[PDB]
Amino acid sequence: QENENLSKFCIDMTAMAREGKIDPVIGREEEIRRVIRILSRRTKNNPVLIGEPGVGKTTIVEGLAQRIVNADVPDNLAACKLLSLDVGALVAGSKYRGEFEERMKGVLKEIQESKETIILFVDAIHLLMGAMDAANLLKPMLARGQLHCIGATTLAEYRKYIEKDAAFERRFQQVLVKEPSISETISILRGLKEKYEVHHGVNIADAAIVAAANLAARYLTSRRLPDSAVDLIDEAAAAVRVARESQPEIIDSLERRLRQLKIEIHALSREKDEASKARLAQAKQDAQNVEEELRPLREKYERERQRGKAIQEAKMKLEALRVKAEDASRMGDHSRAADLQYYAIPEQEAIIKRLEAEKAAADAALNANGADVGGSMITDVVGPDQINEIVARWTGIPVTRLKTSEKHMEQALSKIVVGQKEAVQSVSNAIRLQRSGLSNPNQPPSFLFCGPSGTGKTLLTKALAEFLFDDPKSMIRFDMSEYQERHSLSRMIGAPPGYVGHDAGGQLTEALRRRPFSILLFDAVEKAAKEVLTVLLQLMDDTDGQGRVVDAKNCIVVMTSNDPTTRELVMNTLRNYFLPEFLNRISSVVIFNRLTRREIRKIVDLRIAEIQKRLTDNDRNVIIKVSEEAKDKLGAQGYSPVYGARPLQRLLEKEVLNRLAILILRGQIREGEVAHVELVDGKVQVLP
Amino acid sequence: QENENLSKFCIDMTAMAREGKIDPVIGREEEIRRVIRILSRRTKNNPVLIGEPGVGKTTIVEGLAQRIVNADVPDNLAACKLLSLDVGALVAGSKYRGEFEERMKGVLKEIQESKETIILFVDAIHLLMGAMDAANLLKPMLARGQLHCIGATTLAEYRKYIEKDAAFERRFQQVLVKEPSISETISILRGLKEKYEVHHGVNIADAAIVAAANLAARYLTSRRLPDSAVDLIDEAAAAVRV
Amino acid sequence: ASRMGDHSRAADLQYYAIPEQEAIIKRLEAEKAAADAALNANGADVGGSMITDVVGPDQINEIVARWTGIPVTRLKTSEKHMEQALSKIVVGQKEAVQSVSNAIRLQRSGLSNPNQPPSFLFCGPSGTGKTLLTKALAEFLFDDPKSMIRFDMSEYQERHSLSRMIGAPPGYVGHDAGGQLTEALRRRPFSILLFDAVEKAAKEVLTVLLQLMDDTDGQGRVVDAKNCIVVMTSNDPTTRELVMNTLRNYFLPEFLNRISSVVIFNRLTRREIRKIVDLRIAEIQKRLTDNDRNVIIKVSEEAKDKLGAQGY
Ligand SMILES: Nc1ncnc2c1ncn2[C@@H]1O[C@H](COP(=O)(O)OP(=O)(O)O)[C@@H](O)[C@H]1O
Ligand SMILES: Nc1ncnc2c1ncn2[C@@H]1O[C@H](COP(=O)(O)OP(=O)(O)O)[C@@H](O)[C@H]1O
């Protein structure tokens, strides 16, 4: 009937469903079959697909309505119309008081009168009320009008605006969908590689995608897997188009000098002082040979390029095949079903002919490609490597860990963190239990990092954060004495049993998920009212079928506390603090070392080799030299058990550095002059 | 074909590109090359250039087609037409209910029917949905009409109106282009010193620009560095003429 | 000629074409001798110049000098040290100015440039100079005095009103709620930052201060940044230790070390107060000498001794 407020403000997700524009969502059979039976309840009969942006909670309804027009839907409301009310178009609606609800009330009778057997997907459903956007119109219409709809927005906004009254939850039961794994994406990414390779015109052999979605495993969870794998893979298909088709520069820059000198012979045939004749012969015959050489490739390669446009069309040809039979039987009108399909699908097989030649043609221009220094013609063959650069270019340092594990941690952790001989070892020895798969228990890799009040407890947390996962933003650093006792300790909210992040603010509750592959740390052992201390226990070592609740977390955890003798002292002074059960249920409790000479001396090398980086990374190049005589003033002042080793940096500035750049601005040490610093009384410089 | 709804409301950038009126964009090879590959995606295939006012994010669309009309572009949609849709040009003459969308409705089929391989960089693209300027016509168009466009508005206008729903992000991924520094300006003012010495009739030895772009370093970073510096330098080359 | 593929006029036009370039050097030989020799002829008596086509480091300087600020003072400084100005303008805080001077030269010089900006815990008596040192240096570490956004932390005392001030959330920058910080991170690039009441921190802004001072989109679809110099304020090392431990009742011990040097302000004495008495009459002569009339002002110590003690 009328489709106006439908059509101009919402799009039918059954249009591309009967048609086939929308990419065929393959798996997800868990949520698809359910929402059918949810939308068929008496109570809680409007499913809400709450989840992250990319999990497929629009793809869910995209594959939901797909198989509704084709085959599978109960003859109770089968092969009907589902329209996606995209409210982003009503967000920016006309101007005055309301002027959105009056346009909304138009959608209402449209759906109430024009064939009531109609479903509605709605994107970012919370905004219709919570926002100015008011959706007060549900109360009779969800009862009297009996509309059928599916929401799609993160439950974080379900916890905000979808629980206002009884009509809110009693009419919408929430359908949880959170994240597919590296093996769940690849499985669902197997079926949608069909649609995403053709819009680009590329053929990947196998290993770009496994390199892709498993690189999308740990890094671009910032924009997590199911829409970052397809974002990433679009670029890997989009990488080669500008590569194979751009007629490689090895050819294109070669011909600009040729036409420079060759076409010059044309007009140079006019009578001038005949110092021109020599340039004719020199530009005729030196440019005549090079003519013969570029003539084969720029055609026979562009003949391979000719097959490329021919095959992309040769494939997009087959697109019309599947859309025909689906509608041939959709209405049950086989008057055109059989007669149209018989002719030839082997347009598929009428095209290998182009492939037989081109296959020998991709690498034979490479076969011909070698005469001098080594240029590379990238053709359509994007591979395990071809994806690695996109990670390398966009996300982080170039391919170092990508190609390391594809085709041991101790030496790296210790050439960066010099102390704690067995501690790094014990951490490494306990970390290989979890990430390898040897034994996977309920608890994450828990550590009670206890040591002297400073010099390395959180420091070992940084060195492994780069190597148990990658990012340094995956550490939320805190001190337990920021929220000393019960009240301010109850302010920090990590994971309440029923609600996660409802009302009160914590850097933990949803920040559990803000850093998935991450470390966690809190530094003040003595600040615990022994209830947060225990809800820690039931979250480390210890969900909705229809219970209507959610909670989870998994990462690595290292608890911090500001020759086993003093251990038992701590163990029993931690008996004066903790429960005996607690001290065994985390892990082998691990201990940090004190400050000595040999460890302090190499960190002096680590702060002058660092001060050389911030010297070498800028413009000027000034060479730095320091002997033991100046070193022994700060070396003893450096290891400071009463405060820590952070005073190394403070008095490095207050003693070392401020007497350094002064001589650059005074004129004693220039950029080519060497700076020596000796200590007799006040550690002054010299240049002997 | 017909150029009315195009020409009287928008300017085809790629005109001067063939000619050389548009000043040659020098560096920025990072942002120029990508939007090609962005506009070639399946998902997030319409670049939105969020950045600061003057640093050079229309040169980017100017140097894109430049090295496209001269030499370099894959044979997939090469040396085609990009037009600068100035929505300020749709403001005049539109008074009644709409009177803008009907002038939009003219731009739509003009680009969908007359040689579909056509891109449009659009200035302050946020205004077409954010502003009574409405670009609600996307929903069939970015899907059925499959247009090729590049937005330009400071991320303040992306954070306002370019995040309404998924079609905003799933079709527009934002291309950050922020600011070429004093040695990047000298680098970007290196390549654009050719064009700016003749319109004024001046010969600078070296030290006007390094003193200027490094004096606009700290003071006229107010409005921005490379376009208060290339403004400033137009004052210093225009200084001598009088 | 090659833009389509028809080279019917490509070469024929270019062959005899290019020599115009070399036709303009003949003219140049003369004109070069003509630009500054007309300058050579200009001198017989006093008072006059020739300005020719030669726009230069100076020729731009006036545009800076005329347009942007006071005339050419800092432009020609480096062309052919901070204490005397800072101290002849801000008379107290002997080592504080120095310690500020000693810690500021780490960043803007390039000797060592860490993730954190030149952070300062500007702490001193609750008044008489806390924000005062901030103005004199802002004019010399960068240029504008509008590059100072002043606020008070007890204007937004505790958590809720503290959550109103939005400085830099992890994903969105300045999206919905109003704060004088989020995009004001970018409003003042060459700038100072300061807030005076540390104790109004619920220890979440304090650490997102820390995690933003001490620490963006490849494909993550997110943005955040800020960088300037920062000076943090709090309303014979004895009482220092008191602070360092009374700051334990407030801050985290880690926090008190991640700011490079904690720096201290001095009290009010006679010699520091008496030169500021001279600095308010040397200004009152400026606002006397800057207008039309000329009235000379003289006051003895006896009148000064009423307000001198009432002054500090
Ligand atoms: N069953 C499925 N089969 C194939 N692809 C799927 C499936 N479910 C989800 N997807 C993927 O989800 C992506 C789109 O995510 P989207 O629908 O925007 O998520 P959401 O609706 O949660 O924001 C597509 O790139 C598609 O590859
Ligand atoms: N193993 C180590 N190697 C080098 N430097 C260290 C080491 N442990 C601590 N530091 C120094 O300690 C400072 C930070 O103190 P930290 O050890 O992080 O205290 P906490 O771990 O209690 O937060 C850093 O500046 C760093 O130079």
Ligand SMILES: Nc1ncnc2c1ncn2[C@@H]1O[C@H](COP(=O)(O)OP(=O)(O)O)[C@@H](O)[C@H]1O
């Ligand atoms: N890659 C580049 N090539 C040439 N000029 C540039 C480049 N980047 C910045 N510029 C400078 O920025 C100036 C104007 O920037 P424009 O491109 O008009 O920016 P916006 O629209 O952000 O205001 C140009 O005149 C040029 O002087």
Ligand SMILES: Nc1ncnc2c1ncn2[C@@H]1O[C@H](COP(=O)(O)OP(=O)(O)O)[C@@H](O)[C@H]1O
């Ligand atoms: N070293 C100084 N030199 C000059 N004036 C000073 C100095 N210290 C304090 N003052 C005086 O302090 C007043 C400003 O107080 P201020 O210290 O800025 O308060 P707050 O730091 O709480 O903002 C000015 O009127 C000025 O006369």
